[PDB]
Amino acid sequence: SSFSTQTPYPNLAVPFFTSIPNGLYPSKSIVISGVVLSDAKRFQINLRCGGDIAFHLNPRFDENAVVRNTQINNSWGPEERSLPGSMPFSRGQRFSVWILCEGHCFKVAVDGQHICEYSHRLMNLPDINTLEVAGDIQLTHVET
Ligand SMILES: OC[C@H]1O[C@@H](O[C@H]2[C@H](O)[C@@H](O)[C@@H](O)O[C@@H]2CO)[C@H](O)[C@@H](O)[C@H]1O
Ligand code: NA
């Protein structure tokens, strides 16, 4: 019961880009809320610094997976895929993703359940200053 043809909220169409004020720093929180499309294949949340993706968070409904990675100078590193339980996103279902930036890693929770910790690979946190949300979701709220 959610499809890409539904009218987005003002300024919340996808792909969505917004600034992270002051860039990342230890204790900085980001919250992204929305609904996965009923026919979703994948979507991604990217914390970007210049031409690189410091943190790529990629729920995949075709693979029943949540892929995490970093892209540096247009190349991908090794993927992290471990999950504590089942696939925390579902087609047609609302989600709230909380990303916590600590000094050494990201902590990521979905609907209040921790799903992964991701060690910082790009450590210049204040340059990680752009958030992108793209793919098969409708967005309802973003706080950075
Ligand atoms: O790792 C993030 C990127 O993965 C790309 O696909 C990978 C794939 O997951 C992996 O199994 C292997 O085959 O290499 C592919 C190319 O890196 C996605 O295409 C890309 O969008 C990112 O999600
Ligand atoms: Na799509």
Numbering used by the authors: 2 to 145
Quote the study that presented this structure, word for word.
The rGal-5–lactose complex crystals belong to space group P22121, with only two molecules present in the asymmetric unit, and diffract to a 1.9 Å resolution. The two CRDs present in the asymmetric unit, which have bound lactose (Lac), exhibit very similar features to ligand-free rGal-5, with an RMSD value of only 0.3 Å for all Cα atoms. Intramolecular (hydrogen bonds between Ser2 and Ser3 with Ser39) and intermolecular contacts with symmetry-related molecules (hydrogen bond between Thr6 and Asp40) stabilize this special spatial arrangement. The amino acids of the signature sequence, i.e., His57, Asn59, Arg61, Asn70, Glu80 and Arg82, directly interact with lactose through hydrogen bonding interactions. As commonly found in galectin–lactose complexes, the indole ring of Trp77 stacks to the β-face of the pyranose ring of galactose. rGal-5 interact with Lac with a dissociation constant of 136 ± 16 μM, which is lowered in the case of LacNAc to 30.5 ± 1.9 μM and 5.5 ± 0.6 μM for the blood-group B tetrasaccharide.
Galectins are multi-purpose effectors acting via interactions with distinct counterreceptors based on protein-glycan/protein recognition. We report here the first crystallographic information on the N-terminal extension of the carbohydrate recognition domain of rat galectin-5, which is precisely described as an N-tailed proto-type-like galectin. The overall fold in ligand-free and -loaded rGal-5 is composed of two antiparallel β-sheets (F1 to F5 and S1 to S6 strands) that form the characteristic β-sandwich structure. The presented data shows that the N-terminal extension can adopt an ordered structure and shapes the hypothesis that a ligand-induced shift in the equilibrium between flexible and ordered conformers potentially acts as a molecular switch, enabling new contacts in this region.
